[PDB]
């Protein structure tokens, strides 16, 4: 509920690609290789893996075991993925303790968590790069600027 980076944080892929393991007797790394890109994820030697070598992993798919950083999942895979993840992970606890509870309420709260956005390009507006505001307000401003024919604001969730 606080959207905190977990202590036992799982490592997720920033892009798509194929798995290439490279494990020396003393160190370990995982490489996701695209058609023309390659990402290196140097992780400690004793971390559990979820990726069989030479597999195709989605962006934001977990490589290591553990809890996913919701902000990393947001950057990698987008808002729908984070909403799915938060709702399911909270429900896991509640089902484990034997508590029946409707996704409706958790979704309400998550909706309030996804309430704001961050400007990446002000366009023709008075806003600033990095300024935080509400999704509703930036969408209203962008609709008014598209009506005026101006460049809308580029915003990130």
């Amino acid at each position: 509920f606080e959207a905190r980076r977990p202590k036992a944080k799982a490592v997720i892929s920033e892009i798509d690609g194929v798995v290439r393991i490279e494990e020396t007797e003393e160190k370990l790394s995982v490489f996701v290789e695209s058609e023309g890109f390659s990402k290196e994820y140097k992780l400690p030697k004793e971390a559990r893996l979820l990726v069989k070598d030479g597999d195709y992993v989605e962006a934001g798919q977990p490589l290591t075991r553990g809890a996913i950083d919701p902000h990393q999942l947001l950057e990698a895979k987008g808002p729908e993925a984070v909403e799915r993840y938060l709702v399911e992970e909270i429900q896991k606890v509640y089902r484990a303790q034997g508590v029946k509870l409707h996704d409706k309420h958790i979704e309400i709260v998550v909706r309030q968590m996804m309430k704001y956005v961050e400007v990446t390009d002000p366009g023709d507006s008075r806003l600033l790069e990095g300024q935080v505001l509400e999704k509703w307000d930036v969408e209203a401003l962008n609709e008014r600027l598209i009506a005026e024919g101006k460049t809308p604001v580029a915003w990130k969730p």
């Binding site: 729908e80 909403e83 409707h102 996704d103 409706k104 309400i108």
Partner: protein, 105 residues
């Protein structure tokens, strides 16, 4: 957050999966009944659904029997996810609408 209107007219929705990947990474197995019920019961269908010879119309409030029917359909391989109105996708300002929220449980 209050129910402030009857319908925000959104065309967006979420898809409640009826299957989850096995921890063996072997296949997809059916979710537990209670989980599907907590995901679907009392909700409004965002799209037409035709399973086991029954028409579940858009705008229908899924009763518990509708949920058991959808579970039966998924068991017979006719459906893998249910499109549904949800507060995640409601566009009512300062709250949600009636269709997106669904039942008063």
């Amino acid at each position: 957050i209050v129910v402030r209107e009857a319908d925000c007219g959104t065309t967006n929705y979420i898809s409640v999966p009826l299957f989850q990947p096995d921890e063996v990474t072997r296949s997809l197995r059916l979710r537990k009944r209670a989980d599907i019920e907590a995901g679907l019961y009392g909700r409004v269908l965002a799209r037409e659904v035709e399973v086991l010879g029954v028409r579940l119309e858009e705008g229908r409030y899924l009763s518990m029997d509708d949920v058991h029917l959808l579970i039966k359909a998924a068991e017979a391989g006719e459906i893998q996810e249910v499109p549904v109105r949800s507060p995640l996708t409601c566009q009512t300002r300062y709250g949600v609408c009636q269709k997106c929220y669904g039942y008063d449980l």
